[PDB]
């Protein structure tokens, strides 16, 4: 309820860090690391962002691939509650990641002049 | 709470369509806060090290931090579920964290 005073998507940075970060303040709420492919082109597609959720690395970790060059990883859920259904939680997490990827493209789109 | 440790200690944030900025502190005490600036904020490096104040503001009273350099932190959301044993030393640690965040912002934007 206090989270609702915040914007839905917060884009983050840190000193000395090449990777970026994100906070999602609506359900499901989380902190995540933003990392990038080397051919990220940034052009805004007519089609909506449709990314993939997967397990990656060692040991296996949840990660999101936007397929437009942005990745989301090191998820930390900020909700204490556990979701009743695992399938619907993963779906909600993925949709949130898609919105974030779209919002990130607009951060770049706003800026390039 | 151990996953927090793979992150950098201080994360500076922004949102589209928003004038205010944001911060995440990922070491104890962990929190999300709103970062804002008054009209006398210069972003210039201070003569003394950052020495801010923690206080209660509004009615009802809510915690807020004033860097006294024009930078404010507010709308604190604690990210740790544990409750502190001594309330005095928690505030001291929280205020100290805020001082580091303000200083860090100054160095990032310098």
């Amino acid at each position: 309820n206090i989270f609702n005073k915040y914007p839905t998507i917060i884009h983050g940075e840190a000193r000395g860090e090449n990777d970026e970060f994100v906070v999602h303040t609506r359900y499901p709420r989380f902190l995540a690391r933003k990392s990038f492919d080397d051919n990220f082109t940034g052009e805004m597609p007519a089609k909506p962002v449709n990314g993939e959720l997967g397990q990656i690395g060692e040991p296996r970790r949840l990660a999101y691939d936007s397929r437009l060059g942005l990745w989301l990883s090191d998820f930390i859920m900020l909700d204490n509650n556990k979701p009743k259904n695992m399938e619907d939680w993963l779906g909600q997490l993925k949709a949130a990641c898609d919105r974030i990827a779209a919002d990130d493209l607009m951060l770049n789109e706003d800026a390039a002049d | 709470n151990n996953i927090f440790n793979k992150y950098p200690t201080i994360i500076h944030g922004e949102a589209r369509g928003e004038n205010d900025e944001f911060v995440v502190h990922t070491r104890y005490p962990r929190f999300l806060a709103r970062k804002s600036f008054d009209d006398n904020f210069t972003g210039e490096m201070p003569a003394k090290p950052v020495n801010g104040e923690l206080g209660q503001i509004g009615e009802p009273r809510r915690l807020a931090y004033d860097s006294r350099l024009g930078l404010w932190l507010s709308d604190f959301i604690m990210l740790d579920n544990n409750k502190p044993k001594n309330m005095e030393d928690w505030l001291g640690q929280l205020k100290a964290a805020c001082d580091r965040i303000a200083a860090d912002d100054l160095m990032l934007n310098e």
Binding site: F36, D38, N39, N108 | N19, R34, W72
Partner: peptide, 30 residues
Amino acid sequence: SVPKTGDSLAMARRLARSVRRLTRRRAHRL
């Protein structure tokens, strides 16, 4: 009370954030 950031300070800070972000993303590219 807690201040709300003014438009003039926010526009200058937003531009500097954009310049840093463009520089940071170029290291990932190619």
